[PDB]
Amino acid sequence: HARSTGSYSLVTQQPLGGKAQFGGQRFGEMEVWALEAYGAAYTLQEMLTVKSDDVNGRTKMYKNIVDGNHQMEPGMPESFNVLLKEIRSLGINIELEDE
Amino acid sequence: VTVQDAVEKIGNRFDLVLVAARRARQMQVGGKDPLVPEENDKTTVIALREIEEGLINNQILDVRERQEQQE
Amino acid sequence: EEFDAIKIALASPDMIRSWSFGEVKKPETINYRTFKPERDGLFCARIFGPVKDYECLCGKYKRLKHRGVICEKCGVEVTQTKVRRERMGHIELASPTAHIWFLKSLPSRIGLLLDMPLRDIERVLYFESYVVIEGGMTNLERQQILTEEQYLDALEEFGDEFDAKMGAEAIQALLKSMDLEQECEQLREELNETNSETKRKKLTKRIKLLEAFVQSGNKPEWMILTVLPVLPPDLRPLVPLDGGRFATSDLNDLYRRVINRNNRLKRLLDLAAPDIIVRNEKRMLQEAVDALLDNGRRGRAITGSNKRPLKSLADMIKGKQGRFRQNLLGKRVDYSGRSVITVGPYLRLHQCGLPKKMALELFKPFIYGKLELRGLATTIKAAKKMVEREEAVVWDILDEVIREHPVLLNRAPTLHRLGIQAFEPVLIEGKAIQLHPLVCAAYNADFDGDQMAVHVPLTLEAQLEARALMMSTNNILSPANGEPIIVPSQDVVLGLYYMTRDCVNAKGEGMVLTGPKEAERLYRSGLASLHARVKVRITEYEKDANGELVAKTSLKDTTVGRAILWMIVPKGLPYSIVNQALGKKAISKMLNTCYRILGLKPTVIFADQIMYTGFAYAARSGASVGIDDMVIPEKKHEIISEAEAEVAEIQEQFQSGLVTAGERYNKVIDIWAAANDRVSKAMMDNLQTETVINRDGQEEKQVSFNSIYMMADSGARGSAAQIRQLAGMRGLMAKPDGSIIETPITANFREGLNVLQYFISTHGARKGLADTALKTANSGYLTRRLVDVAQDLVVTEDDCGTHEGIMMTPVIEGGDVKEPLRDRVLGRVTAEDVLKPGTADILVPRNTLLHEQWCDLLEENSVDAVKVRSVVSCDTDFGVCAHCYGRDLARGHIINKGEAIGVIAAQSIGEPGTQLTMRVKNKGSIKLSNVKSVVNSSGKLVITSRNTELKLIDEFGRTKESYKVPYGAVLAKGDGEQVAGGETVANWDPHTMPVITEVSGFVRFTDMIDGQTITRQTDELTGLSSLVVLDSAERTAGGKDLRPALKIVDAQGNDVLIPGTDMPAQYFLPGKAIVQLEDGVQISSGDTLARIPQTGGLPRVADLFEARRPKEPAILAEISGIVSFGKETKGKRRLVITPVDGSDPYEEMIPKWRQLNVFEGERVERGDVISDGPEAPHDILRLRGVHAVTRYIVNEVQDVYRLQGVKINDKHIEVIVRQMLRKATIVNAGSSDFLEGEQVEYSRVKIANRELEANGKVGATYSRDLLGITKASLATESFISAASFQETTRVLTEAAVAGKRDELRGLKENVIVGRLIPAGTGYAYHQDRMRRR
DNA sequence: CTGAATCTCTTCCCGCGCGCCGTAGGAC
DNA sequence: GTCCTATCGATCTTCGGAAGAGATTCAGA
């Protein structure tokens, strides 16, 4: 099975899963540790932001590839927002700090 | 190609990649054509070759950009 | 956008309103007949946002141009639908409502504040018991709870001299009533008085909480919910599973219940329903909310008709299914694929083969760009349209695109960073992905069907990252140990092994060849056999003192195969290494040494040629295996028959009664053990010996060319055990209980088993599978714990500044060494200059990187131990210094700054853990330690010390041996005597504990009382009956009162003084000591008369890291003082240890059953074993921790793997230890606002003292604390990481009350938010980013 | 305020392939 | 038949396991 591009789940913008649906491979949690073991970071950043969880970045990435730039914009993982909302949906007040 | 040698010139694995990427984007879309000859390689390798010679380096890159700004 | 920290807080009610964009009124969702969202309901458009694109439901507007207007007909703003997923709504609660977590956190936050137990306040909350307030006017109370009837009768007693309340209202009122700041100061005053520790700890918890609470921006009254937020609907989608028959959506369902529950209460409030009904309603409302949050923390979870518990809000966050594991720390990624694996011999090491089908898909965005760069595609859709063709031009472009693009391949589950590596692709017509054989071994790939996953790096930076680091050529060395992981395969090694072997006589043998060139030709023509013996001329190169390679030529006698193989060998390597049979052993070190001598670039190409050659001649060898190959020794039957006869004698002798059943049993198995071994001797010796050959006449013997022997002998596969089973006997076997069946499996496999024999074997086989199944599951959960705690550590400093360090020795156990000091000191840095052999001369600088030659130089000298700096000793702040870590296993040279070692260490340990299981002797000179001894009347030295050790020297002057010599044991060796094996060390009592008459004189019963303290035991048949001492814990009160002591006497009427001191020499006695050398008998110094009576892998390492106090720890001494008894044994026995200076009145409570290494007057020092048994690491830390406990822990874990022969580098363990004691405890006011008795993270206190003492102000006195990794991780300061680890709710609450702010230090935090982690590449950017600060 | 013998909500390798399968009660 | 409508919570096939630390809790000292 192989997928270059495809739809994304509603509840979380991450790609669909499996073969029946044209889902993408899951980058396992342990494998991230392996990546972390090596000093590479840009790969990891691209891995989650561009390839998994940023509507804006991946779309812009899509164009850049057609533009031959092969450059990504940092973006921000969407699912993180989902978590923040849920936590904020609890009795907890949670915020992002600028300074 | 496989380098395992250019790292000696710059002296660090991480700096090698970081500096190389800085140069690579120049030849990618930034202009400033490759200094080393071309063998239908890709800019990542081409820039990698430039450091592999010790021809390009961070200090030269720092000089290259600042002097270019001019008018 | 720019941000740097996350903060946690409790939302004041207005804050919820601030988030709100509308009150959700109606408990309905959609117009079920035509599915509009329900206005004012759980999906109201105007509250949340438009359902479609940019337009409202009433269609007042239809373009972006209309941005920024409500539509009066249906309200909702004309805006992007995405806003629908973002904005939140609020609910108005009919009554104050309690948030459960704060109620039922294991330490009840509300309860602790109230100082009222969880169970009691629950009554008030649920409206089943009243709490009275303002009752000081009467017998009533500030906050006393009372029965409803108690309250109702109290109402008869008092009209309104009080107030009694129920539910959250009462709780919130009590919170509001708190003069919270004064309460803490009021409690602070109490602490000063508190005279008992159990009270103090309870108190300390409360004040700290209150101080934190007030200092935070939180206020307790907010905790009681009055307004409630509801998640944006899109985040709680209701998918039409089957059109109108939508899939269940629990959160909506819970909301539905609450809203309806709320409304119904509202109605009665409107109607002013009778009090009892509404009271119940209030609880039912609380119940629903309680369920909504947790749905299971309450007495009973609620469930639908499907009979499954509904998923509460917390569920989506907590645990394995939570967001952290489900989405954040691992996620599905586009441009990925999975394939089945295959081996491509033709591939070079850096290359990998993949199928065109996957490749065509994976690079579509790249293809489109090239097409439009080609201009062949007018537009993207046209490009996509052409790709559908799979036209030739597409393949041409695909080749151009893929021309050098690196790619990522990973097996699952990954063991370590070697588990993922980068490759350059080549295109394949089939569908499997082709892998280089040498690499796959590192991947642990077995081609029985293993799948593999592929990912493509997109950007310039990633491509360089992949090529620079991950590319296979870079990763020849293991990081767990700086050793080649590339050692060839079973087949590759065997073919070379066969090639390198020699034949005594062979075709073409005995010629002289100028060099390999003609050797290859001669073999190729078949005029000479591969392993035929031959004389050859050869040239080889030596690299000079600087490295310049110069040639020498010489003639050699060799076998032909060696010469041809030499052609593959590059220059600079001596021919001798290959002039021998090459098993995996020889190849392993040959390749390893080759790389170090020649470097990496020749090595990688050298490996490929080795791989190619091995396959080629393995095929030519025709190294097949057949049943005839398995020669069986005839002795098998003979020994079996011989052994059987003897076993029959043992059984008959047992029938005769001549032997017990156990002795009968164990003797039989010993007979079998000898029989099996003799079979192994015959079987193994024959197979290797099996070749007799003629050489120019006459015959000679040589190692056999048998297929089976070659496979095992080469080391390619199997072991001597396998062949012993197949050719010899399957041997002794045991039940699942581990008991050995009293008859072994005499049958081999070449001949079939009998039914029962085979049935017996099933027990063992399944057990092995069973263990593996659970082990693999258990080990993973261990690794997860490891990674979390370890992740934080990073090398950031060059030098920390310490001149201190730990000292390294070879493990000296089971007598002499069991490991070389050479291997351990390698790659480290000295702490002090090495003292040269002799004295005062220094051999190595104080901080030299102890690389190979110096280590060789050191071992060349007479060194026994050396002192080295360590990561634990590293003084770095928020990290580690490079010099403390020293060499990198995967690079040979010192580490590059900015690398997170912690993950490396965790993974290094993680992989090998899977391999665990879950189901005088020599020459030398003598030396003693912990020595105290006296000489007896027999002219030999006997030990008075209670912890004496024996150690021996090798007459080179280096010492490697150790043993424990029991207290009272007689030393056979003094003087540091020279000794040899069999000259046994000592006369000692391994059965029982002695008591020694250390002084010389007459042993008397002076103050030894007959009957009450020493009693004549009957002794049964002995005829003689012996006086025996009895213990305090067993004897009458007289035993306590008249406690006997063995006292000697001389002319004074009392024993001559304890040598040098006038104290009586009476030896205070325990029970069960038997005396028949009764009063008045002669005795000499050191004589004794008393004899008093005395697993697995993965779990052992597991609890060790968690540092659990053992089930029953050994009892150890503390303080340097003399011991004494008084608080007579009743439950615990009490002993006083009195240091003669300063702190005499120290005493402890001790269990009765433990044996004691001291009784009443022994002078003992800190940490001395009062009894043996497992030590609690914490106390080791407490006594002499940092260096000592490190060495203890390091040795303990190393033993597990050293048992398994797994070469884990110790330095990784030091990394774990760093975290284990990253915490510290303060007991001091110091000159900083740390609580007088406080627990802190070490770095924060360390730097605080740096500035505080630099100011001349009193630094606080602290001790460093031991936390189990699980406990340590949860205690970490960056709550986000801990929150993601486990027990989420207990963590969040901790942050909540604290209102903590996170600076997102470490990897996990950065990973979650997705910004560049401070790893090698990312660290440089992050380092510069702070430079902007 | 000491003592165990009592006490309950955490956790239980990583991924993959099919198959099935999801509120109750009623105008008669 | 189609379509409307209001709660949802008792008694039945339940028990099918168990390591580890904060309350609350058994015996006086």
Place this chain on the structure above:
RNA sequence: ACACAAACGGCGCGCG
């Protein structure tokens, strides 16, 4: 108007 497409949650069986 130059543009989306069919997964939410469980259970069983297998896989390395």
